[model samples]
Target chain A: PKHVMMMAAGTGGHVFPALAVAKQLQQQGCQVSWLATPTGMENRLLKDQNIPIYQIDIQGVRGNGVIRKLAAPFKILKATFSAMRYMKQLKVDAVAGFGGYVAGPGGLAARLLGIPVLIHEQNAVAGFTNAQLSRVAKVVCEAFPNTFPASEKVVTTGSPKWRYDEREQADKPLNILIVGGSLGAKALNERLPPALKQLEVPLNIFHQCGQQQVEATQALYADAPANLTIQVLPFIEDMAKAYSEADLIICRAGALTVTEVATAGVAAVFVPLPIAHQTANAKFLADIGAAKICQQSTMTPEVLNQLFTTLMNRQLLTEMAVKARQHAQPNATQHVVDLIQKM
Target chain B: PKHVMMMAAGTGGHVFPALAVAKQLQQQGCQVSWLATPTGMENRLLKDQNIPIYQIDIQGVRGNGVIRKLAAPFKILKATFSAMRYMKQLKVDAVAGFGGYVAGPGGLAARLLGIPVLIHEQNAVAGFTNAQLSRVAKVVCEAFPNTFPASEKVVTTILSPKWRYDEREQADKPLNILIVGGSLGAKALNERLPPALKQLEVPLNIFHQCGQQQVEATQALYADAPANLTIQVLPFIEDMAKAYSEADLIICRAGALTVTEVATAGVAAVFVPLPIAVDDHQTANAKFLADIGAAKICQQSTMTPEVLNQLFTTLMNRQLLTEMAVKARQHAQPNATQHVVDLIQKM
Candidate 1:
């Protein structure tokens, strides 16, 4: 059995793709292990999968203040030494990095060790870590096309998440699903209901307001027209069910959400959170004519209602849903595993 | 005899120190060769010392416009592979990086080959390449204390040129001033110093280096100097040690190597730091002496003819020059060349 080491962390958007490829490599008889931060979504996920875990005490410069950013190089270098030791001890055949902060130091260690290195960029615009590593990576696998400027090293391997079946469209009684993530956006909670009230046509809305805004959002719902049928949800247990039931989605465009939207073939109006890397995710869809972007700064009731009315065309919505489905790859996990085997 | 490879390139700021160490390494019977980019002062200095120089085809990302910056990684990688090949052929005992364009590849190739890497960080702020290499380096030699994080690898030591110093042998004029910049001449210093010196009002003698290509333009700038201002304009200074011996004050850029030489030469200075350097370390490099009243810093952004003229007048006073000269030598390490040579030999 060949030994393969994979590295990722920060969020499930980065971690899940690695897990998908890891499972295939494991079943196919490669001794696969994980490298990650001491704390992340990868903790329980790696443990429950029964894979051996290696930890590094490093953090990202994003969403932080000055101290962490300044201390990053020392932390990255120190962690690189640890990574080298483990790679030496295991005598791993190769290393793969699924983008995160750890990828920069982790891939560098592999390069210094003279081990073949691979990296995967899961966005249209490569993240900072992936951009640095891609210069040296033997294979630069990506989710969407043109993740980086064309190079022989780059391969489009899509994301390794499960796909949702394409949903059907209706001209009247539009199904609008508003997802504010777990914390929920106050902008969405305050403005969305008033925008729905302005619509004359019948509407069926499913709004996941999160636990904090459940009471406040229901009060806004009471003031809307009876023609606008609304369901205020604290959280949706099954995302596959929620996505398949909706013809149109009004939500934030995080990496995971965007990937699911593409696979589901559902048209969307993306309100991207500026703090995170949301604009680029939404831009990828908007550029493909699969979605429209609503900036948070311009998302008053008037703008939101106008955006909803514009995307209400059945012909435009159907064509967008088709293009979105064209972007999703059904067998991304197999493709990643194939590349690892070849390396 | 252990084979030691020294990597340095670009200006004499990096090459001069390596040449200083290469000489001592030769004296002590170590096989010293040089690694450099294809064309730099490294070739000239190494050839003069009869040291064998092996070169790689690479350039820096800093000065070039956008296209070279985009192509830097590929060029860096190709040079690294080339570095590994020469290192293998020489079977070098270790590699030392004196900081410049070639240092990054040479040090990284050493790390890849499992060769002991020694890096000399020449500024108060450790450069990006030095920061990356210092993590894996056996020794991080710094010209300034606290150039990097406090680590076992970081050694606060000198990496200076072999410039001889004596207390000013002759200040024949009211004041003797030396104005030196890089081989290309510091543009701001060339433009701003001549008019200021001509209007100093104090009787002064000046030796100005306008770089080889900059000679005529700068000479034209000084054409109408007052008869009291006796001046000699040259393309370059052939002998810096002799120049310092006659100089009471120097007007120069505050690059790390320049700062070290001034301290060792025990001269008061007016430092004009290159405003856009990485980490702005040039400013901090001069701040050490400026803090001790040995030197004054005039930022290039704020520098004008009047500002230059006033700083010269204020610093050229005898009591101030005598006092500043003493303070300049307070932290100088006179045996700098020997100390770094000892480091290479010990490794």
Candidate 2:
């Protein structure tokens, strides 16, 4: 049996794609284990799935101050050595990295051990770890065109998505879903409540206001119009149900979120996290005419109000939904698995 | 005449290569203007060389906090628009970048204006800006093999060195050892070399470029040296040709420019690469030379006074030095400047 070690540690955006691919690899008779940190959603998510996970003590090098920045190489070196020991002990045949802090050390260890390294870049703009590892990788799988530097090894395997049951769109009472990704976006929670409350038409709102903002946001919309039926929660365990009910979404433009929204054929207003990959994710959606992008600096109640009203038009919403569906790669999980099988 | 706008801002490592190519382009009747930041060594260097320079305000996105990182894209966007305006006014035919913060905005402007963009990655590992711009660049020129992701557009151009080699026969006594660490000098080499050389049992002389900060202390430390050991310390070495002519061996960092100079000068070396270089590229650079029997790699972290003493003693043999010198010469590309100029002409 081929043992492939996968590295995916970080937010839901990074973890989900890795999980999808891991499940597919398992079905193909490959023994897949995860290389991740002990903390974060990955721990719980991986535990529920009953997959083996190895922990590495590593954090992001960027956004840290001078002393940490200077100390980063030494930390990475230590982590790489530790990872090397783990890979040797596990007798891993191949390694696949879905971008995160652990990916760099994991991939480096795999390379040092003379194992084949495969990397998947989920964003439209490549992350630093993936970009650095691309030079040494056997194959650099990309989700979007021009996302990474053009290389002979690069193959466009659309972002691997989890399979969800197909849901028929609800016709009446336009459902608007507000998700600020897994961590919850402060800007979206702050600006969206009041703007959404001012909607002229009767609508059902499902707001996933992250764990931290649940109480405050629930209290903020305590008194609302009879026409508006708003449900506020810290988390949504059932995304399929949420997708089934929503006609439109206001969410952060993470690659996984964009892929999920498109797969569900849901039109969206993308408020991109002003980081490296998020901006490119927003651009991809905006370019495809499936979503509208609002920079965080320009994201105000007035802007949201205008976008909400414009998207509420039936023809516009229908057209955007069709475009979104067209962009969806429902077979992405299979495609990514096939690529791994080829390797 | 082809008008090429060159982007080479920040340190001498980034600027000097661009300056060499710019001078050669000028010699070939091409009008070259520089796109650099307002401050730093580039301002004075370009001014003294009489090259037309345009300034852009930009900084790297990495190593900053979340707020600054978030603001970086907007800052780059603004710089790109500004560069576009400058390129439009200059009516530039092509844009060439030697990697730094200015390269991203400058290359973007060239692409937006439908002009050919050429970039030269001076290190074995491509920098952040160059890697990003490589996608849209017309030609991504590299100095070392496997430095960038394999692309049809990627081509290797040996680093251009300003000085040329003048063959010299080996001398029996007074074995001149030249020690430099590029423009800024390395602290590891600076502290370790003087102590290491003290243990060398040979009739030797030292020329050390200890940078400005360490020059006084270094001179003071070596004041009471033995009659056989003669030491001269300088803040910076301007006459590289003279230095090359006097030296039998060199000990320095494995920067791209310094490696090229060593190859061109045909000198054996003990390369101590900076541990924190991008992707450990300096190590790769040192390995290339070491692979060809031209030099030895003494990693900064693991290198001790005894190891340095042993390496110095072993390399001091006249026959080994002669063989290494010949091997070093085999890697030199004396016409690197000409090859780049030809590439521009073709484009």
Off by over 4 Å in 1: A59-72, A155-172, B1-347
Provide all candidates' interface root-mean-square deviations. Answer: 12.0, 6.7
CA lDDT of each prediction against the hidden true structure = 0.76, 0.76
Prediction-by-prediction clash tally:
0, 0
Where model 2 places Cα greater than 4 Å from the true spot, the runs are: A1-68, A72-343, B38-41, B59-70, B149-168, B182-185, B223-227
How many times do residue backbones clash in model 1? 0
lDDT of 1 by residue, A148-221 (tens): 77564544544322223344332357777889876447778888889887887777889999887899989998
Clashing pairs in 2: none
Q: DockQ score for model 1, please?
A: 0.01
